Design a protein around this motif. Sequence first.
Motif, PDB file in Angstrom:
ATOM      1  N   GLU A  87       4.249  -3.758  11.010  1.00 52.71           N
ATOM      2  CA  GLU A  87       2.851  -3.433  10.934  1.00 52.71           C
ATOM      3  C   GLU A  87       2.487  -2.461  12.042  1.00 52.71           C
ATOM      4  OE1 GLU A  87       0.375  -4.442   8.507  1.00 52.71           O
ATOM      5  OE2 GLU A  87      -0.313  -2.594   9.556  1.00 52.71           O
ATOM      6  N   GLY A  88       1.910  -1.331  11.651  1.00 53.21           N
ATOM      7  CA  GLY A  88       1.420  -0.347  12.597  1.00 53.21           C
ATOM      8  C   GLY A  88       2.323   0.854  12.819  1.00 53.21           C
ATOM      9  N   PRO A 131       0.830  -1.193   0.000  1.00 52.92           N
ATOM     10  CA  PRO A 131       0.000   0.000   0.000  1.00 52.92           C
ATOM     11  C   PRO A 131       0.865   1.243   0.000  1.00 52.92           C
ATOM     12  CG  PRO A 131      -0.080  -1.070   2.131  1.00 52.92           C
ATOM     13  CD  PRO A 131       0.613  -2.013   1.196  1.00 52.92           C
ATOM     14  N   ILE A 132       0.464   2.227  -0.776  1.00 53.19           N
ATOM     15  CA  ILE A 132       1.165   3.504  -0.775  1.00 53.19           C
ATOM     16  C   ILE A 132       0.539   4.528   0.165  1.00 53.19           C
ATOM     17  CG2 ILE A 132       2.109   3.286  -3.075  1.00 53.19           C
ATOM     18  CD1 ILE A 132      -0.236   5.292  -3.830  1.00 53.19           C
ATOM     19  N   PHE A 133       1.372   5.454   0.611  1.00 55.11           N
ATOM     20  CA  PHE A 133       0.908   6.644   1.267  1.00 55.11           C
ATOM     21  C   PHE A 133       0.268   7.522   0.214  1.00 55.11           C
ATOM     22  CE2 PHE A 133       2.828   6.443   5.503  1.00 55.11           C
ATOM     23  CZ  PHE A 133       3.767   5.450   5.358  1.00 55.11           C
ATOM     24  N   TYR A 146      -8.177   5.067   0.433  1.00 56.31           N
ATOM     25  CA  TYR A 146      -8.569   4.224  -0.695  1.00 56.31           C
ATOM     26  C   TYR A 146      -8.925   2.798  -0.268  1.00 56.31           C
ATOM     27  CZ  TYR A 146      -3.606   2.991  -0.532  1.00 56.31           C
ATOM     28  OH  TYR A 146      -2.380   2.567  -0.127  1.00 56.31           O
ATOM     29  N   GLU A 147      -8.698   2.461   0.999  1.00 57.06           N
ATOM     30  CA  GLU A 147      -9.343   1.310   1.656  1.00 57.06           C
ATOM     31  C   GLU A 147     -10.156   1.833   2.834  1.00 57.06           C
ATOM     32  OE1 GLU A 147      -6.654  -2.219   2.108  1.00 57.06           O
ATOM     33  OE2 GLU A 147      -5.045  -0.783   1.635  1.00 57.06           O
ATOM     34  N   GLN A 161      -2.270   1.961  15.018  1.00 60.33           N
ATOM     35  CA  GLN A 161      -2.404   1.889  13.573  1.00 60.33           C
ATOM     36  C   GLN A 161      -2.213   0.470  13.032  1.00 60.33           C
ATOM     37  OE1 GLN A 161      -3.506   5.781  13.331  1.00 60.33           O
ATOM     38  NE2 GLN A 161      -3.267   4.348  11.614  1.00 60.33           N
ATOM     39  N   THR A 162      -2.367  -0.532  13.876  1.00 63.93           N
ATOM     40  CA  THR A 162      -2.214  -1.915  13.420  1.00 63.93           C
ATOM     41  C   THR A 162      -3.198  -2.207  12.304  1.00 63.93           C
ATOM     42  OG1 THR A 162      -1.416  -2.673  15.553  1.00 63.93           O
ATOM     43  CG2 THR A 162      -2.316  -4.303  14.122  1.00 63.93           C
ATOM     44  N   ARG A 163      -2.648  -2.559  11.134  1.00 61.26           N
ATOM     45  CA  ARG A 163      -3.413  -2.966   9.929  1.00 61.26           C
ATOM     46  C   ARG A 163      -4.266  -1.837   9.338  1.00 61.26           C
ATOM     47  NH1 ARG A 163      -4.055  -8.304   8.588  1.00 61.26           N
ATOM     48  NH2 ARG A 163      -2.756  -9.896   9.621  1.00 61.26           N
ATOM     49  N   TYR A 209       4.261   1.633   2.298  1.00 66.85           N
ATOM     50  CA  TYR A 209       4.447   1.243   3.686  1.00 66.85           C
ATOM     51  C   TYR A 209       5.768   0.515   3.903  1.00 66.85           C
ATOM     52  CZ  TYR A 209      -0.341   2.155   5.446  1.00 66.85           C
ATOM     53  OH  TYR A 209      -1.523   2.703   5.878  1.00 66.85           O
ATOM     54  N   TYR A 210       6.286  -0.122   2.847  1.00 72.42           N
ATOM     55  CA  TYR A 210       7.503  -0.946   2.952  1.00 72.42           C
ATOM     56  C   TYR A 210       8.706  -0.279   2.301  1.00 72.42           C
ATOM     57  CZ  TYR A 210       3.899  -4.312   4.230  1.00 72.42           C
ATOM     58  OH  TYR A 210       2.822  -4.935   4.817  1.00 72.42           O
ATOM     59  N   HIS A 259       3.352   3.049  10.343  1.00 73.02           N
ATOM     60  CA  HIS A 259       3.353   3.915   9.183  1.00 73.02           C
ATOM     61  C   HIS A 259       3.089   5.391   9.476  1.00 73.02           C
ATOM     62  CE1 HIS A 259      -0.567   1.923   9.550  1.00 73.02           C
ATOM     63  NE2 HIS A 259      -1.127   3.012   9.047  1.00 73.02           N
ATOM     64  N   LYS A 260       2.635   5.721  10.680  1.00 74.15           N
ATOM     65  CA  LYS A 260       2.457   7.136  11.046  1.00 74.15           C
ATOM     66  C   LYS A 260       3.451   7.578  12.117  1.00 74.15           C
ATOM     67  CE  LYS A 260      -2.273   6.833   9.504  1.00 74.15           C
ATOM     68  NZ  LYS A 260      -3.652   6.494   9.946  1.00 74.15           N
ATOM     69  N   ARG A 295      -5.122   1.287   7.037  1.00 77.28           N
ATOM     70  CA  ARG A 295      -4.753   1.611   5.683  1.00 77.28           C
ATOM     71  C   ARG A 295      -5.365   2.937   5.260  1.00 77.28           C
ATOM     72  NH1 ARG A 295      -1.661  -1.660   7.119  1.00 77.28           N
ATOM     73  NH2 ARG A 295      -1.090  -3.643   6.095  1.00 77.28           N
ATOM     74  N   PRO A 296      -4.854   3.527   4.193  1.00 79.82           N
ATOM     75  CA  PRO A 296      -5.332   4.840   3.772  1.00 79.82           C
ATOM     76  C   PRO A 296      -6.744   4.837   3.212  1.00 79.82           C
ATOM     77  CG  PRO A 296      -3.143   4.347   2.913  1.00 79.82           C
ATOM     78  CD  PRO A 296      -3.749   3.051   3.343  1.00 79.82           C
TER      79      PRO A 296
END
Lengths: 360, 361, 109, 105
Positions: free
Chosen positions: B278-279, B202-204, C80-81, C73-75, B219-220, B281-282, C77-78
């Motif tokens: 996971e988790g 998934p992208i930002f 678009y989901e 923020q576990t799992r 995310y990666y 990303h912010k 998504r932005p």
Amino acid sequence: REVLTGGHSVSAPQENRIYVMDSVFMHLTESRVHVYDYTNGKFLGMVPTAFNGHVQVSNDGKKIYTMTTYHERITRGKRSDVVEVWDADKLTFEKEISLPPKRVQGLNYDGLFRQTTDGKFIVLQNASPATSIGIVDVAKGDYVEDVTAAAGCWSVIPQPNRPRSFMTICGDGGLLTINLGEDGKVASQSRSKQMFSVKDDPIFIAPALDKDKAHFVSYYGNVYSADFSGDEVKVDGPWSLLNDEDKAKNWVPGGYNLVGLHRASGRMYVFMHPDGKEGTHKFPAAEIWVMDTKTKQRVARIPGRDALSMTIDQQRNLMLTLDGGNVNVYDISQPEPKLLRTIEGAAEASLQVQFHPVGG
Amino acid sequence: REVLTGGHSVSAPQENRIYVMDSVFMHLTESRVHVYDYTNGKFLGMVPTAFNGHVQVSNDGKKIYTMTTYHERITRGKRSDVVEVWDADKLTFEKEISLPPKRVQGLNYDGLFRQTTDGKFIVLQNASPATSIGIVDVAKGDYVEDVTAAAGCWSVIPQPNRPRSFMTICGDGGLLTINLGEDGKVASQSRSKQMFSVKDDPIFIAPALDKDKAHFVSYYGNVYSADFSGDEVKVDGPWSLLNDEDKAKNWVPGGYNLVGLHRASGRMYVFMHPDGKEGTHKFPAAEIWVMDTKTKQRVARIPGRDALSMTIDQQRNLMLTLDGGNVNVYDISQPEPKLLRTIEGAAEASLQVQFHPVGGT
Amino acid sequence: EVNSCDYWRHCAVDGFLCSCCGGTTTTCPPGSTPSPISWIGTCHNPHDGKDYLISYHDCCGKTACGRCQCNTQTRERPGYEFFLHNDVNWCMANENSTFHCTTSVLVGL
Amino acid sequence: EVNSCDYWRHCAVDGFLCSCCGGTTTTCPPGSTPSPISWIGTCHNPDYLISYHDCCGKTACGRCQCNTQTRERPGYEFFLHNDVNWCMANENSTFHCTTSVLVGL
Ligand SMILES: N=CCc1c[nH]c2ccccc12
Ligand SMILES: N=CCc1c[nH]c2ccccc12
């Protein structure tokens, strides 16, 4: 499967509840009342009060009344000053009562938003900036009287020994008493003799209120009293809170809702600080002094915890104090108050806490 | 002796101004825009924006546009979602434009409230929660109509090489391009092939936006690109931000408005942190990485100062970063950014800062 | 433990925990209204080792509770989901969209 | 020096200093409106009448909060009183910041 539900009532009994009026001065359009359980510090709920809300609980304990100002677009558009009636247990809005657009906007002194002893009328301070007292008939949901006789006066002190009477402090240093009829219109009024010198010994507006009299403290630590056992208020004072040692260190009162009275004992509680001088009248308490109003002598002194405002519950013999953010709970069943707990972070900017009424 | 007056203009010139969108999440009904002079940290003024305001400056630099929600009694009563037009120099309200009651309420990503390159239309994200894009005709002061084609998509990326075109990111991992007519209605549209795997990479949403292409980070720590130099968008990627050492320590991007592009050099700026999983990303930036998008190599890395959001000025070669409360000012005229100053206490809860536009034709 | 951001059910809460606001994990504080819509998280139960769907309905129509703010923020998504996304107000379709607090409602495995 | 609560003319300010809010001691920040009424203080210049007009119609500035009380009196001396919103009669009463305007000796 779990299901989220609403419609719930406050989880603690009314007798446990206190109301911390958070002005949120840094964001004063989002003032609110925070409801706490004083026995354990638990947050129970809240009531939003828009710009500079004021709050009180109905004397019968069933409703919360707020007073606030809205504008159609907050910072522009038409003004609506209102009283709102909220259910005390569901913390839900029930009714809006329209006011003229002059309700007092100011810090949360008790005497700006009060009610008659019988609970039938809300009595509120207006400033346009000319002052008058507004009367709201709760049952009718209507603003029914505007007491222009109170021009040049300030704040509302209900008389607990009469159903629909209150006093206000006037620019002459005396008190104006208003007796409302059962329709909420002024039924009669009277003016006391001068109680205090406005110029030389100004009093704090906060009363130490007994059933049939009220005491006031002054900027210089004197005490004045108004006896309303009769239709005509009799005034007296000063006596000094201070002995010679106290005077040597320049002790004076300071705070906002800074006094209280324990009616059964006649003890008066006052926030005090040393090194008093011009401009220190709103300083946080270094101490709370406990005064015997019959002997006119101090009986105890305890640390003030930087408190600015207080309130008393007569029947459980409690005092709350409030430093702007934190609420201290004291047992005052004996002359020396005993600190039971502190509720931290009860508000961001509160100068008023109140108990849920239990006395009917 | 003295007389109080109002009616005054902002004291510093436009080219010194930045806009810090303070959500004031703790008191979200009193969000506001704080206007600062980035050259010296001076507070210049503010614009109140009620509940969860969003903000942008008109492309021509004359007006501030806000988007907000009112209710007649705040917590009850009829809802009014609006765009407001404010004068930039006087910081006064001029006009309210009514929106349907579904403007996006959410954190202040740039792509939720944008404008066409030509400045004639405001382009905003709706969610009811069904998504669509809203179009506001600035000259008319009118809402045009929903771009319903954007259902299941999110956010607005203007195409700087066309007057009234923009793209949005769709749930299929591709981009939808919308071309508006002179009336603000959809004149044409197109959908790219899948750019990224929604499930696997998934992208930002924050673009690193060039004049005719946009880059996105995942995310990666992969990079995807959308080239819109032709009428059809061409997509590609991934390439990795990461070398073996980076990968070994699990460096990944994190933040909100977390990337930027310096268009003249092709340098892309990205907030990064180690121990990704996971988790995260912010998470605040441990570092800012500076990537050459031509060579696909990192050319600098510097301390992140816990930043979450950024913005780039192409005309002065600057980057601002923002940690929620404080704004850092960087000179990015060379590959390694140079920290000029920090403006402390610019906001209580801001995830978005923007420059007052200079030039940009 | 439910008032902590690290409580396992709160793994995609962005907001104030309703259990700190006069409600519980599954009940709105008095006078606040549940959202009919929500974002969903998948959270790992540390006891039985299984993953559960948690529905993060907001409570709405009162101003911000301000207590027990979490941003996990576990799992997540932005947008678009969209129904996995927690940077939007899930009160957005309520009669009053003012955000009060967030609940963590267990749906099932 | 003017941005300090201890600045001599701020001796009865309860509010945010307008000079920290994009205005000056005698000018409202852009887009905020002077109050036509005010409380008045008497301040010593190390004595002057100072009029504390508020600036109104924008939400709280939040910067340089002061609560100084020299010669301030309660609401029964209403124009010496600073625990009320001197924006109360403005077209929009939302309080933004407070100014400190020198009137005279
Ligand atoms: N200069 C007085 C600011 C102020 C003092 N108390 C207030 C209450 C509401 C609004 C404003 C105020
Ligand atoms: N559960 C999400 C709270 C939230 C997250 N971002 C928001 C923006 C506006 C209002 C509410 C929110």
